[PDB]
């Protein structure tokens, strides 16, 4: 993992002081239950791994 | 000599054992999960989760 | 009244619980046929039934 | 009509009745057919061979009965809290649910069972045995019914290699339903590639395949240059 | 006794990584008490056994 693990949305539309903006908010918030999600299951294998051992 | 020979298999069928000791307590932690996972309203990405254990 | 119309159908649309959507028309299929059963007891056939729309 | 396409009404008719979905008399005259061959074939590894298909189609056979009684035995029950729409759907849905999950276990056990006759086969190693018309008849037979058996599930994208080497078979390429289960399947993998947004080297592999087989099951059904024939072409063009 | 001692049934409905699935929800429950049923017995042999030694 590293921020490159969903898709690293930064700023939004409009006027910033960056280079970068969000894409289409329901996507960006698909996308954070993307990120939720995935390293919540990573964390579930390790959950798992550990009963294991 | 063949008191030693009857005591000799006493260790190899307890060793024997206690590997089926995991075994069988691995099966009723399968059932526990198998139980979770023929709830028709757990999810599919769920399952795939307890399928992981 | 009309807005009221829109804001049922948008209820009926976006009624999310556990990313299920339970009122819009998914049912009695979607891209599977995955719906509302429910595991009561510990072994089977011991099922309930709801679906709603 | 031409004499041509008098036989190749015949011819089509026939293929279309080879492909009909399973049932007694099918049954009866497909294996039928398939134990006349393995007669003169006197050779242990295909009777084999041909022991694990039958027991394969027997499985799909007992389900379709099973299929039916399942269905009649929910149809027979009295049902007091289905007086509201939501609930008749709920149940609805819940049957095919177990209808679907035991012809899923159905097919996977026929699969098993069709996999253990191509295994058998396997073992047939003389060339001059494999070329016979009795080990090619059941070869096809084994993957048209694995075809069928996957396409009643909708398992499309499964039943592509299994149709590319019954085509291989003696002749079977000549056969319009081979080419229309070939050309649906490869249409539902293109369809698959646009909703999934997969690359595009594999959107124009499924298109450039389905188009092949839709010209050619066209070809072979309605004949080279005619009006059907020259339509598809010129839509491929 | 292996993996192959019961119906070692692999995967659970729904879309998959592997080219497996699950059986009748009864039946694998059936299956895990037989899995049970046939190993936690064949202890009861080698406790039966060990007693006779």
Redesign the interface.
Known sequence: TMTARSLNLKGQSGELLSLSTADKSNDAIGTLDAALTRISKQRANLGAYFNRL | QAERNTEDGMSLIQTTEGFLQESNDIIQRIRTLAIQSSNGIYTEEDRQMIQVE | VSQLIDEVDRIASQAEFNKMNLLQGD???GSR?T???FHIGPNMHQRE????? | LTEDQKKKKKEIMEQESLWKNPDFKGYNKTFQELHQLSKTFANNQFRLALSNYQSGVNTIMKNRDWVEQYRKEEAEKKRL?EKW???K??????E??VV???K??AK?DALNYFSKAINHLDEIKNPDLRERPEFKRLLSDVYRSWIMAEYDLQNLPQTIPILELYIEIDDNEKEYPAHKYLASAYSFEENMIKKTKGPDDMLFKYRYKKNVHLLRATELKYGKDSPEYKHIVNVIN
């Open positions: 049912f009695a299929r046929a719906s509302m059963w039934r709801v679906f709603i729309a | 809290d729409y939501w609930q759907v709920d149940r609805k849905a819940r095919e649910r679907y999950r035991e899923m276990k996977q």
